[PDB]
Design a binder for these strands. Structure first.
Ligand SMILES: [Zn+2]
Ligand SMILES: [Zn+2]
Lengths: 694, 107, 174, 60, 146, 202, 290
RNA sequence: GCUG
DNA sequence: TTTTTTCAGACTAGAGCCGCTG
DNA sequence: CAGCGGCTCTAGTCTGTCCAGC
């Protein structure tokens, strides 16, 4: 199949390269903003019970700048760079506030201005032919994916974080294996930990002043009876025996019923707010509020039913105990456990805080003026201020400081100025990943090259110096996934035979045959036959019934099958080999070039598939057709795509020692060469141009 | 070993009554009189024996009219049986022959 | 050890075939630049890439990369690169060589910070010590750390014979 | 490029707070003889050179 | 000491710790034991797919889900045991696959509840339930055909 | 693979479709059955199905520590009041079982009374988990606390156990007027219509 | 020298396991005078250097053997009166390997084990084949204490130095005489230099703190000379001894070995600004004003 | 952020 | 009211602990 | 039967992590 190379240009026309930045903002401006507005929809005043301020639909418009009182003319990216203006668009929202006593509905009220990344759907440049670009004074060969804030082009660097909703088994400094699942939802993001500090299991959370012994938490949740707790965690002699010291701790105390455990947890809840909170929330009630929205929030109580939270808690306890025995702690360097967050996610978190601050400030204004100033009606629309939202985002992009106190997020260095030393310097900056651990000076940690990075992160492209492995660069053919709906994956799984977990006593989870199904971190049931769920789910995805980026993976050592549609996960395209023969078939490859098929047709015809790092652990990829065996499952589309944009420019990289290739990647960015066709028009702080480039 | 109450399913504790030792619940009246011998064996893992017998150890299992080894057809060989793990394992048989111009290890 | 033998024997053959006029050999024969390991790697075979003195560890479960069978202890699934730099490295071999190369680059950057902190700590404790006309190394306080420097009283730089001052056989010949 | 990396300072602007030279070529700068350089001079045994460099030619 | 109220050793199949002194079945074997070896009737529990391949008859609808509550009494299908232990539930033109569910070992009771009067009624225990069957669509054959 | 064995006919009965419940006891092993234990009451709410049962435990058997039974009964009930009392006698006579609801819908679950050569399905109205209730201790604290310092009406049911002839009688209503043979008018849809029904277009 | 390492490894002591940290990290350990060094290694000389049999017996004395290894079975026995966890002890493994253990020795070891079995309730039965630990006085004494004892009874060390864990016997390759020296990974130099058959006169360590405590200051000077000059020639990196003869002699001239940390500077220097120019500038200036 |  | 974003390290108090020490 | 001596123990806490150059 000589033209297996032709697939790299075709995947690249639609996705890949700098697209992973563009398609991400597009999801935030078109889908995530509305999910955030539904979550913080409705503001209610303490002074008047009747007053209500819901938000109905939020739209983000075309970028325009008004230089007069009411002109509202359109604006171009070049003019903003020259006049040091910000390229941004108005955020317009629809509300139905109480007003005097009616339900006045307003359509299209501006709440502020949103910074717009170039080449995004809302950007003017999109859909423009090269001749049209000349009038807009923008180079056609411009990567995009950057924001013009105050006349400086700024790029939000991709950040690598451990995956949310997934329990992480990790040793503490004491060598004490613990566990920690970060629950990220659309309402509350919180950290819930489990710890064995004296040979007995305690649960820790920031709303609880002291660590609570786990059996008390189980009794509060509603699994009263020691046998039911022991049956859920384990029935093997070792698992039960090790949870034996922990049983005594509740027995020593007198907790034996839900009420006596809920009250104990309440006497420990931090009650920080004693002012403006009115009178309410008894100690027992505060506990039933915490156990139902604060602890393990990703799992959802139906009607104050913790049957689901209790099983998930048992799975965490069992994982600590098996790990404590053999000391097989999960690696936090494996790229399967790490999800990269690009602009959309960072912007959505920043917007979520600013929308809640704007809503809060409107309630505080309403509570102060509604009951005192006058019978004259309080109209929120007059007091609403555009500045809080506009100023907040711009400042975060202009200065790279992500200080969000609500989520305890204090990260600086999120945004950098786009480097215009050369065209390559700009393209490389777009595909740049920033690590989570940045102060680590241990050589064999994040700084090392991990085999899991194969095909996802360029092996040789890294800065030499303070950040030898801290900063990484994406390879050519890599797609970072975006969040999907999950309605179909839940349905296919039930019909595929996955029995519910509410209908079984926990003893099943310890039988060797039963395996647990997890979707984005929430249990969907228990299936006896792992292979049929895995080989049916793949067959369905190939026909296109299920989304291409959903990934099914199975871990035999811990009997669980994981289905992931979360987003932020690196995915690489691979040809499917069935019966020792590649599926491209030569004729299809000619059809791509001729025009009958595009890359999407190959994906839904079962010719090509996307595999994430977890799925790759279950596959036996063969780099070349000659290396095909009986066990081989897939074939690599092109070997050279393993290297990245900077690495590729080196001729014959394979024939050189590897440190030399790393130096070239850094030097190529520092070279002096043509920047763009609009280079003469631009008036940047420093521009270096070779007089006669070749 | 964990044993649980048939009534409420809390964990039992052993205590002493006026006539017998009892398994007793902490939360309900249920007690169970220990009338006869009851036991629970752990069977832990013993040490490795592989490098312990090599190099002319103090073996003793040889007896009169013992079989000759199969290669040399002479009785110039020792043989022994040992548990490799805990004593619930069925004992394995092993033997080593040492003769002039002849070194071998067999099973 | 066996993988090491293959590289050593391949290197010996490469040196024997090389003419007495190869620029790389001449630089190795004098010590101007290079070594015979560098020439062997370029012309014959680059060796097993070693991370922390051991074969590449398994990033995936029971497998270094998804391109080899699980639980494979075979050479080449654990970092042995048969090809020379001149022949070129196959994609899996290139990744293993990059992993070993990065370990060195990370080590140098981390090591420079550690040695610098250490030098400040040593120079902030030994700076006051100085030899005196009485021949006794003493502290600023006047406490005697030593009665003669290095027992002999000799200075390390002036030695011409591996910690011994004269090297008499050479002196008589001159 | 060497043209942009060439800096020399004799007597020039001194910072108001410490009366020591500036830290930037743009500000006329002045080079920092740091502790490691100072340690090498102590090893050489040059008492006068350290006094001239760190007091007279900096902030006497 | 009462022999029928011994303390519960934790694995429920292994309840007997004190005394007077398993492998996994498959759906072909389960149906064979209850036909040839023992003629006794037994209550099996089977979970069917969320939608059966039917139309709600005259039920005033929209392609809504079809359940056993919507159909009418009578023969609903045929159950085939094949060679090599494959079991199929042919429930129309389509064949659904049948597999053994999680092996429960806690007690399960099948009971009637009838509120025959406004405030009182009858509760009746019809029998114990031992085995669970799972019915699922054969997505490979359904899709391969079209 | 021809159907060499057991082509079994499958029927369907609706006579108990609004009456049949599956009760399950997560902490009680399959060998220890409540068939012998006398049941004293059954309570249900027919909507928001929450069944409660009370079972009598004897006191002349050796497994009852009467010394402790007198103490726990004295904690729960005031020494001689007896107008409202959990236990009539001076000992703990009864264990109460409280239900938790497993699932909101039960449309896809069916009980299957196997007989030789045929299978009879019947829809389930509910699946409930029965657990031993621990209220007796919460009330014992409430009557210790005082010394120191819902719209749905209950339905009462008579309990007929597995030994009673009413159980052998009503077990026949799980069968349906046996049909010799037919192809159902419903469940006629084709494989391609069925695949599009379980996997709807986005 | 520390700046110029190529960071090569190949430093396992030639046993192909238990690599010794040997680079600038080892130089940091020797200079800091840490009481705990990672990779502590007492090299011992046997009284008889040619007998593998003698080496095997001596290794048994130095290394720690847990009760569970030597115990055939371990049963918690509940009886109508008195529940006791009785450990069954094998008498063939005790003979198969030459370990001098008995029920009376085990009974002594079970007490003074931190298992709270300090009372004489623990008893010996039969012929070194059964030891019975009945229960404890308090702290959830019922069957709870018993559950802890059953899990923690196998861990008790019947014989051998608790601190040492991983003694390995190394054979020299010299053709004329083949000799065995056992290198123990552990820290109790006093015990490992007294066990019968280890010739104390030639046993040595790599922890200056362990040597200083057991063999005077002057031997602690010679290890600071040696273990720096051992780790400096291991990394190439030749150095004069007269530099190390000064660094050791500064480090141990005020009584005890004063490691060059922030803390060792306070015990070496009297002047404040020399301490104040080093770390802890706040406390060292206020305390010298006090 | 990069050069040293 | 709601996450973490390095890795040790050799000091400084308490909490006991058990046993002789009177 | 009672007490204070040292223990001994876990965590606690503050303290660093190359030079500079733009
Ligand atoms: Zn009980
Ligand atoms: Zn022989």
């Amino acid at each position: 199949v000589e033209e297996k190379w032709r697939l790299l240009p075709a995947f690249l026309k639609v996705k890949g390269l700098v697209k992973q930045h563009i398609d991400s903002f597009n999801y935030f401006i078109n889908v995530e903003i509305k999910k955030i507005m539904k979550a913080n929809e409705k503001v209610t005043s303490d002074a008047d019970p009747m007053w209500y301020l819901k938000y109905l639909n939020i739209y983000v418009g075309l970028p325009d700048v008004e230089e007069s009182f009411n002109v509202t003319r359109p604006v171009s990216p070049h003019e903003c760079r020259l006049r040091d203006m910000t390229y941004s668009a108005p955020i317009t929202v629809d509300i139905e506030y109480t007003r005097g006593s009616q339900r006045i509905i307003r359509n299209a009220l501006p709440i502020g201005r949103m910074p717009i990344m170039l080449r995004s759907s809302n950007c003017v440049l999109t859909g423009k032919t090269p001749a049209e670009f000349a009038k807009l004074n923008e180079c056609p060969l411009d990567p995009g994916g950057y924001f013009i804030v105050k006349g400086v082009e700024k790029v939000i660097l991709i950040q690598e974080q451990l995956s949310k909703n997934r329990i992480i088994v990790e040793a503490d400094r004491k060598g004490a294996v613990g566990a920690s699942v970060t629950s990220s939802t659309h309402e509350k993001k919180s950290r819930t930990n489990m710890a064995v500090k004296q040979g007995r299991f305690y649960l820790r959370h920031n709303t609880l002043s002291e660590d609570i012994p786990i059996v008390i938490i189980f009794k509060a949740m509603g699994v009263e009876s020691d046998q039911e707790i022991v049956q859920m965690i384990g029935t093997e002699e070792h698992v039960m025996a090790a949870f034996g010291p922990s049983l005594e701790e509740c027995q020593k105390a007198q907790i034996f019923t839900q009420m006596q455990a809920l009250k104990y947890i309440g006497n420990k809840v931090r009650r920080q707010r004693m002012w403006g909170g009115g009178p309410k929330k008894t100690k027992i009630e505060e506990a039933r509020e915490l156990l139902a929205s604060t602890i393990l929030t990703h799992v959802p109580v139906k009607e104050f039913n913790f049957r689901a939270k209790c099983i998930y808690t048992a799975v965490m306890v069992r994982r600590v105990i098996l790990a404590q025995g053999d000391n097989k702690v999960d690696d936090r360097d494996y790229y399967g456990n790490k999800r990269l967050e690009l602009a959309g996610q960072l912007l959505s978190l920043l917007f979520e805080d600013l929308f809640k601050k704007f809503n809060s400030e409107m309630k505080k204004i309403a509570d102060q003026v509604i009951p005192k100033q006058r019978a004259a009606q309080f109209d929120v629309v007059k007091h609403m201020r555009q500045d809080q939202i506009t100023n907040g985002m711009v400042n975060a992009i202009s200065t790279g400081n992500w200080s969000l106190k609500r989520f305890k997020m204090d990260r600086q260095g999120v945004t950098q100025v786009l480097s215009r030393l050369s065209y390559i310097s700009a393209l490389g900056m777009m595909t740049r990943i920033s690590s989570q651990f940045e102060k680590t000076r241990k050589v064999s940690g994040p700084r090392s090259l991990q085999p899991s990075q194969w095909g996802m992160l360029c092996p040789s492209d890294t800065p030499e110096g303070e950040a030898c492995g801290l900063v990484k660069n994406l390879a050519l053919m890599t797609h970072i996934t975006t969040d999907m709906e999950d309605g179909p994956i839940v349905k296919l799984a039930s019909n595929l035979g996955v029995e519910d977990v509410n209908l079984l006593c926990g003893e099943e989870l310890s039988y060797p045959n039963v395996f647990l199904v997890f979707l984005n971190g929430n249990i969907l049931g228990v299936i006896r036959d792992h292979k049929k769920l895995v080989n049916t789910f793949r067959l369905m995805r190939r026909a296109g019934y299920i989304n291409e980026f959903v990934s099914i993976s199975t871990n035999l050592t811990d009997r669980c099958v994981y289905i992931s549609s979360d987003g932020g996960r690196l995915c690489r395209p691979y040809i499917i080999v069935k019966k020792q023969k590649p599926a491209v078939t030569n004729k299809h490859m000619e059809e791509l070039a001729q025009g009958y098929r595009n890359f999407e047709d190959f994906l839904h015809e079962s010719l090509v598939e996307y595999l994430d790092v977890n799925e790759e652990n279950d596959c036996n990829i063969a780099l070349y057709e000659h290396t095909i065996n009986k066990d081989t499952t897939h074939l690599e589309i092109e070997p050279f795509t393993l290297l990245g944009v900077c690495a590729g420019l080196i001729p014959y990289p394979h024939h050189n020692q590897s440190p030399r290739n790393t130096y070239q990647c850094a030097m190529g960015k520092q070279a002096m060469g043509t920047i763009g066709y609009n280079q003469r028009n631009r008036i940047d702080t420093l521009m270096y141009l070779l007089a006669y480039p070749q | 070993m964990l044993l649980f109450c048939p009534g409420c399913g809390n964990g039992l504790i052993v205590e002493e009554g006026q006539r017998c030792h009892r398994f007793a619940c902490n939360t309900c009246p249920y007690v169970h009189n220990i009338t006869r011998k009851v036991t629970n064996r752990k069977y832990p893992k013993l040490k490795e024996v592989d490098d312990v017998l090599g190099g002319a150890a103090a073996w003793e299992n040889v007896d009169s009219t013992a079989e000759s080894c199969p290669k040399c057809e002479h009785p110039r060989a020792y043989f022994m049986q040992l548990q490799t793990r805990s004593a619930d394992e069925p004992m394995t048989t092993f033997y080593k022959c040492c003769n002039a111009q002849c070194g071998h290890r067999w099973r | 050890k066996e993988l090491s033998v293959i590289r050593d024997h391949a290197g010996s053959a490469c040196l024997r075939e090389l003419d007495k006029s190869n620029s790389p050999l001449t630089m190795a024969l004098c010590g101007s630049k290079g070594s015979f390991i560098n020439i062997s790697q370029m012309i014959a075979c680059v060796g097993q890439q070693a991370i922390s003195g051991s074969r590449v560890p398994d990033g995936f479960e029971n497998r270094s990369l998804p391109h080899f069978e699980k639980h494979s202890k075979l050479p080449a699934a654990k970092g042995f690169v048969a090809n020379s730099f001149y022949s070129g490295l196959t994609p899996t071999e290139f990744f293993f060589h990059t992993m070993a190369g990065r370990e060195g680059l990370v080590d140098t950057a981390v090591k420079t910070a550690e040695t610098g902190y250490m030098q400040r700590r040593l120079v902030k404790s030994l700076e006051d010590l100085c030899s005196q006309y009485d021949l006794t190394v003493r502290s600023s306080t006047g406490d005697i750390i030593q009665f003669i420097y290095g027992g002999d009283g000799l200075d390390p730089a002036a030695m011409e014979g591996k910690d011994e001052p004269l090297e008499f056989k050479r002196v008589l010949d001159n | 490029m060497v043209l942009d990396k060439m800096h020399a300072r004799a007597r020039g602007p001194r910072a108001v707070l410490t009366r020591q030279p500036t830290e930037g070529r743009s500000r006329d700068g002045g080079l920092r003889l740091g502790e490691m350089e100072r340690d090498c001079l102590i090893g050489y045994g040059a008492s006068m050179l350290l006094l001239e460099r760190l007091m007279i030619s900096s902030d006497a | 000491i009462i022999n029928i109220k011994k303390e519960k050793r934790e694995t429920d199949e292994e309840t007997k710790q004190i005394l007077r002194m398993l492998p996994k079945d498959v759906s072909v074997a389960e149906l064979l034991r209850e036909l040839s070896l023992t003629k006794e009737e037994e209550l099996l529990f089977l979970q069917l797919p969320d939608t059966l391949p039917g139309q709600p008859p005259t039920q005033d609808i929209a392609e809504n889900a079809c359940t056993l509550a919507d159909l009418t009494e009578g023969q609903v299908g045929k159950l085939l045991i094949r060679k090599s232990g494959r079991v199929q539930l042919l429930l129309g033109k389509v064949t659904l696959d049948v597999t053994m569910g999680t092996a429960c070992s806690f007690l399960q009771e099948l009971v009637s509840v009838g509120l025959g009067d406004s405030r009182t009624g009858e509760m009746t225990v019809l029998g114990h339930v031992k085995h669970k069957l799972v019915c699922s669509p054969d997505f490979e054959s359904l899709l391969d055909h079209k | 693979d021809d159907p060499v064995v057991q082509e079994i006919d499958v029927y369907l009965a609706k006579s108990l479709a609004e009456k049949l419940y599956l009760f399950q006891y997560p902490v009680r092993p399959a060998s220890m059955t409540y068939d012998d234990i006398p049941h004293l009451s059954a309570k249900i709410k027919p909507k928001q199905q929450k069944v409660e049962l009370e079972m009598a435990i004897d006191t002349l058997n050796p497994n009852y520590c009467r010394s402790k039974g007198e103490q726990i009964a004295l904690n729960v009930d005031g020494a001689c009041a007896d107008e409202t009392s959990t236990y009539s006698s001076k000992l703990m006579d009864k264990q109460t079982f409280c239900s938790s609801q497993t699932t909101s819908n039960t449309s896809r679950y069916a009980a299957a009374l196997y007989r030789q050569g045929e299978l009879h399905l019947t829809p389930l109205h509910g699946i409930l988990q029965l657990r031993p209730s621990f209220s007796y201790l919460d009330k014992a604290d409430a009557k210790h606390r005082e010394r120191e310092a819902a719209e749905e009406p209950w339905v009462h049911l008579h309990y007929y156990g597995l030994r009673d002839s009413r159980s052998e009688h009503e077990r026949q209503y799980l069968l349906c007027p046996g049909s010799s043979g037919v192809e159902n008018t419903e469940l006629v849809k084709s494989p391609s219509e069925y695949l599009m029904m379980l996997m709807p277009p986005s | 020298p520390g700046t110029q390492m190529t960071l090569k490894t190949f430093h396992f002591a030639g046993v192909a396991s238990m690599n010794i940290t040997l680079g600038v990290p080892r130089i940091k350990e020797i200079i800091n005078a840490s009481k705990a060094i990672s990779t502590p290694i007492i090299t011992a000389q046997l009284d008889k250097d040619d007998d593998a049999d003698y080496a095997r017996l001596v290794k048994g004395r130095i290394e720690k053997t847990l009760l569970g290894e030597i115990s055939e079975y371990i049963e918690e026995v509940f009886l109508p009166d008195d529940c006791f966890i009785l450990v069954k002890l094998s008498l063939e493994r005790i003979r198969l390997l030459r370990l001098e253990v008995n029920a009376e020795t085990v009974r002594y070891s079970i007490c003074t084990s931190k298992l709270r079995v300090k009372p004489g309730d623990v008893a010996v039965h039969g012929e070194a084949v059964v030891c019975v630990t009945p229960r404890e006085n308090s702290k959830s004494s019922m069957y709870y204490v018993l559950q802890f004892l059953k899990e923690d009874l196998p861990k008790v060390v019947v014989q051998g130095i608790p601190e040492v864990s991983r003694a390995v016997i190394h054979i020299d390759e010299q053709s004329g005489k083949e000799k065995y020296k056992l290198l123990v990974e552990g820290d109790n130099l006093r015990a490992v230099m007294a066990t019968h058959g280890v010739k104390g006169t030639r046993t040595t360590s790599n922890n200056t703190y362990e040597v200083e405590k057991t063999l005077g200051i002057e031997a602690a000077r010679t290890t600071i000379i040696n273990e720096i000059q051992y780790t400096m020639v291991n990394h190439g990196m030749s150095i004069d001894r007269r530099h190390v003869m000064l660094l050791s002699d500064l480090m141990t001239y005020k009584g005890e070995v004063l490691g060059i940390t922030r803390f060792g500077l306070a015990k070496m220097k009297e002047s404040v600004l020399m301490l104040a120019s080093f770390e802890k500038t706040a406390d060292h200036l206020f305390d010298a004003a006090y």
